[PDB]
Assembly symmetry: D2
Homo-oligomer: 262 residues x 4
């Protein structure tokens, strides 16, 4: 099939990429970075996030694979020594595909909307002043949040920023998104839930400005300052990222290997 | 239909129960506490947990309703002033039913198994000495836990003990269970994940003894000391508790009303 | 004595200030906002923080008083109805003074040092990229911190940002400072202590850059972007803020009244 | 001087103890386990806690030393390979002594008081039912605690149970004690501070029963069920444990070595 390979751009990843391209030249595999059906990312989870967003308009026609040239990644979960074995099995095909849920972010602004997809999370912080937003769940006012910010995570993202904020780790077969707080003010006057919140599909979480309407909005590794924002809306996307799998590497073992020992 | 009413047993709940029985006597509703199809609990969430376990063998043929004579409950979410309006709508029927997932707990012991269902959670603590268990997820060793104990929660239970342990709040339409730690030891020698873990249906979490094999095992409000325990196993039950609903009272508003303000 | 009054600048605070000035005109009290010996702040804790920094060069010759025209403050802990009783007792003098410890922040930058005093806390965040600093305690490398940032709090500051980050509340008679993390990355590769750390007088905590050397540094309500920073150093100051007291309002009751109920 | 040696009682510790006794026989050092002036503990922190409580009536006349035959301990902070070098320097004397603060626990019960000293912490849990106590600080009611229990820690104890409960780590030169919660219930009806609280010397924290008056009270490794308890009182002790030091091993390096890497 058509395939492309993206590289972190250090010497190890570049030369692994060139060696895999050579191995692919021995099969019926065309290098096409415009309409690939296989996207291989060589580097770390950061590289893999860039690959994802590089091809987010063709998610339904692409199976991703990540190779980690440094430590193990949750996405880049293949070792560089297995790259040849990877070339062959990928060339033959007949591989299974697994899908992880994604987070849809809608930003309504000015006197119009922008939509984004996140593989890890979307966060909202302030443009410097205090951060105050009303949190509305399915059109009912839930809380008035004052603090540093809010993080809305996919399942595969729960091991990332969400984790460092005290969120739960969620198996990626659960179609959900998780909201976590960053340093909420809680006293007699100001009140938030504190706990992470886990939302199923079709639930809509809306953040609405109270005073300042300029926010720093992040989607995975991208961080945009948005002006005249009237609303930020979160829901589980109907779109899914597809991974090529050649071997059982269970999520919970990936968790164990990354945080417990390996 | 056949119905029964359980009471917290204070004066307010007893007399509300007697008044509802009188109102039911004006319809084709038989009082039957052996095979009821409607179980009304009058009191607090504790009373409702007892009603649930009182009839856990007939969960598929019963719709539960909770009336709170004190503060609002997450199960006992009807006000005593609406009890007459409750009698009538229940008598006419045609009400919708909602189902919440349950937690199955299997205790394998001695030289044989006991199974329990939990509406809130099942927890494991030690018989006094140190608590050390191996946590095995789908037959793979995940961590060696040393600390006070572990809590495995249903979705509707996430607002209970789970919450106080830092777990996430999960919408009850998600078929899952959540594992939280109680005071884990973490140093250079001992290592746990720390984060809550959320498991989908068909995942099996197994706790296995390391030294001492006597544990205090709780299921909702019941706490049993178990001896010669070889294993404790958690999975989402195939069984579900059914609630009668007459009006939209969304879960997240119940959360708001219980923890944010009302 | 010489006195001045600072106002939040809303109608309630401005007119309370004018009424207290009139009451002071009935005694031997001169209004002097250049060398006051009494500084009254009327507003909220924010106003009081500004008063403190307005006169931080004359801390040894000033006793501060805060009046809260909104909710109770931890500094602005006098009610507007007691303002007349305040004028009289202040005019007579013979009041006791209480002192709270302060935090000294030294910023060494470029190819030279700036020093600041904090009543609540000093924090360090990144100029947008990832935040990575080496934490050095009394010249020994303690940890390599990667995450959102770090907060170093005084005792009276522990009820502020420090609290929202999970720090301990410390009685202000303890001469100490407390370091808390903001969303640290912890995995097999990256490791921080996680817990808040409480340092006595004469201990020096030094933050040192690893890659990027531009940081957002805050001191109480002031937030400065610092460039070519080589080091950030924290220690308990030898200087102390002095409060005028006329009545026992214990710290722990102030805590109770602000967070538990009032 | 007079000295004694306590052993964990495994083969490594017993034979190290016998070898040190032989080395001591080459100096003017008498083995006396009744009135020693030097108490050497060989084992882990558990062994050292037992040594402390074995001689808690002669704390002012004893300097303790801990040797760790397993992993590094916070008390047993000497390696077994340095045991000979230890014998000699101890024999010559002229060593410095360092003191750590202790926690005094007073239990008033029945229709009379018992007092205990803790090197790590004293905790209070329930005899099985729900745990509900009123927390009174310096005779003012601070909160009504409902949950699993409460932990009151010394400074050197903050790296132990306190840490696992989210308490701050405190340098042992600070004369203080720290109160942490175990799984507090927090909703609209029930309210605790949540944060750890750090108390200076002369502050008195009193726990008072609300319904049940049977509590499980722990002091370091000892756990006693107390009946007809009317009050539990915590304050910093006027007594201090004395360590013999022969070399700088700073507290914060001990923390680093135990939790960060070694
Ligand atoms: N250097 C390039 C920039 C990194 N960048 C690609 C990443 C990543 C990433 N994804 C995951 C994952 N799904 N499960 C577990 N591990 C993951 N990683 C690790 O995260 C560490 C730091 O990137 C590294 O080990 C990665 O291996 C953006 C992501 O930074 C996260 N992020 C931001 N601020 C954070 C904070 N304060 N605490 C924790 N994570 C934070 C957030 O989540 C973004 O999306
Ligand atoms: N008095 C009779 C015994 C109470 N008993 C019926 C209960 C309950 C209950 N269920 C829920 C719920 N699903 N969502 C939110 N609220 C709930 N409640 C409240 O919990 C408070 C204390 O029962 C009360 O307000 C209830 O309203 C057993 C449950 O105690 C919980 N439990 C035990 N130890 C806990 C701790 N340390 N922290 C927090 N919860 C704890 C655990 O979870 C059991 O199952
Ligand atoms: N509106 C003017 C700007 C506020 N500003 C004067 C303040 C303050 C303040 N001091 C204290 C205190 N010692 N004990 C308890 N209460 C305190 N207050 C309250 O804090 C709330 C929000 O100011 C209000 O109720 C105040 O009453 C700067 C302080 O924002 C704190 N701060 C910043 N970011 C925070 C976060 N994410 N979470 C918690 N606190 C945060 C930080 O600490 C600064 O220094
Ligand atoms: N095996 C004999 C029994 C252990 N026993 C001697 C101990 C100890 C101890 N003291 C310290 C210390 N000051 N700084 C750091 N490390 C310490 N240790 C370690 O603690 C681990 C487990 O003892 C081991 O590595 C020790 O090395 C009693 C102490 O268990 C603590 N304790 C109890 N329950 C706990 C929990 N849930 N989480 C955390 N600690 C807990 C509590 O604190 C007692 O007092």
């Amino acid at each position: 099939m058509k395939y492309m390979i993206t590289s972190k751009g250090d010497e190890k990843s570049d030369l692994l990429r060139l060696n895999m391209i050579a191995g692919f030249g021995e099969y019926d595999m065309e290098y096409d970075d415009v309409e690939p059906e296989i996207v291989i990312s060589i580097g770390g989870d950061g590289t893999f996030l860039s690959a994802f967003h590089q091809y987010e308009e063709r998610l339904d026609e692409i199976a991703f694979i990540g190779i980690h040239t440094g430590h193990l990644g949750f996405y880049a979960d293949w070792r560089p020594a297995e790259a040849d074995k990877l070339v062959k099995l990928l060339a033959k095909g007949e591989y299974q595909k697994v899908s992880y849920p994604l987070l849809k972010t809608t930003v309504k602004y000015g006197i119009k909307e922008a939509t984004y997809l996140a593989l890890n999370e979307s966060t909202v912080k302030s443009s410097g002043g205090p951060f105050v937003v009303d949190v509305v769940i399915n059109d009912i006012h839930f809380e008035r949040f004052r603090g540093d910010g809010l993080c809305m995570s996919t399942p595969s993202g729960t091991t990332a920023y969400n984790k460092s904020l005290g969120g739960a780790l969620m198996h990626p077969s659960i179609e959900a998104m998780q909201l976590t707080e960053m340093a909420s003010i809680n006293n007699r006057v100001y009140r938030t839930i504190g706990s992470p919140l886990v939302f199923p599909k079709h639930h809509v979480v809306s953040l609405q400005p109270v005073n300042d309407k300029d926010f720093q909005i992040s989607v995975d590794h991208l961080s945009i300052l948005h002006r005249d924002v009237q609303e930020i809306r979160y829901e589980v996307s109907a779109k899914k990222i597809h991974f090529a799998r050649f071997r059982s590497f269970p999520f919970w073992r990936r968790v164990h290997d990354s945080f417990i020992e390996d």
